Design a protein around this ligand. Structure first.
Ligand code: NA
Ligand code: NA
Ligand SMILES: [Zn+2]
Ligand SMILES: [Zn+2]
Ligand SMILES: [Zn+2]
Ligand SMILES: [Zn+2]
Lengths: 162, 162
DNA sequence: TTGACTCTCTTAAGAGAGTCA
DNA sequence: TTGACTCTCTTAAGAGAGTCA
């Protein structure tokens, strides 16, 4: 198995490569009607992506390194967290985009949490709109708002009470 | 079936049957430290479920009626909304449990909205904690809270900015 | 050892349809 | 006609692994 020193070297090589990804400035809602700026380090749309990187799905990538003749491969956003626990409360930890930008690999835009916690950030009001996440959101979730409900609760007769 | 009269008759028979489901009182967080009470009309755990109802998955059911000598069948929570548009902004409309209780078939606890709006209610602070849903939530979402994030955003070197 | 492709799987909110009796 | 089972699919946040040169 890899030593913790070998893992750190993988993280370091990953950071050096992602650091050369195009850095894109995005203006984003923070909640409370305020706007902020995030700087995303975006993997390219098509090959080549960068040393060690390959696309396994439309918006999925993996990072691969060969150490002492053994090929090791990780989800491309999981590498910052290789020295962290991989589960919590019986749930698998997942890479969670605080910037909600899947191509971004900026580790300052990622956290490591259950898939439920991950998903829920899509609807968060944001760091200036009432976010209660202990690891605070960087922006208002893209799906926050009143929604677009087509039909509300209703009955034709009188069989029901709320 | 095809005619509006036939659809109204389906809705009316569905309501009469669901109206005979056991009524279970559930005390629920509303947000803001307040508590409320909902009356869920719960489909039984095992057969028989009620006239027209059958279980197609651990927590999935369907409602079936014979009209024009043919069998018509729907997801068991979709029946209240058979006269509504079945899509919005090009997204499929789905039955959304405001009570977050899958066995409940109380139409006063259901709305009809995109799967994204549906999911997002799991994290809503609730009607007394800041819900902004235009069709208002009945309770705080079961997954609302600080989360259990294992690791936050971090870098080893100096390649990244937020 | 490396790049650029290929394939299927997980989760938890939701669906459609077939086989029998 | 009605009941009680069986199966796979959709979505959008996420994953693991094989083949070839
Ligand atoms: Na996410
Ligand atoms: Na729901
Ligand atoms: Zn980013
Ligand atoms: Zn948040
Ligand atoms: Zn209910
Ligand atoms: Zn709400």
């Amino acid at each position: 198995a890899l030593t913790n020193a070998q893992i750190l070297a993988v993280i370091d090589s990953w950071e050096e490569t992602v650091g050369q990804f195009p850095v894109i400035t995005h203006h984003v809602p923070l909640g409370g009607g305020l706007q902020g700026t995030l700087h995303c380090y975006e993997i390219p749309l098509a090959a080549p992506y960068g040393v060690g990187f390959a696309k396994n799905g439309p918006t999925r990538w993996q990072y691969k390194r060969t150490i002492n003749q053994v090929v090791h491969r990780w989800g491309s956003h999981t590498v910052p967290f290789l020295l962290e626990p991989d589960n919590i409360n019986g749930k698998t930890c997942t890479a969670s985009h605080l910037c909600h930008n899947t191509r971004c690999h900026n580790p300052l835009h990622l956290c490591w949490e259950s898939l439920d916690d991950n998903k829920g950030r899509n609807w968060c009001p944001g760091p200036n709109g009432g976010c209660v996440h202990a690891v605070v959101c960087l922006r208002q979730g893209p799906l926050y708002g009143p929604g677009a409900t087509v039909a509300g609760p209703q009955q034709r007769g009188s069989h029901f009470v709320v």
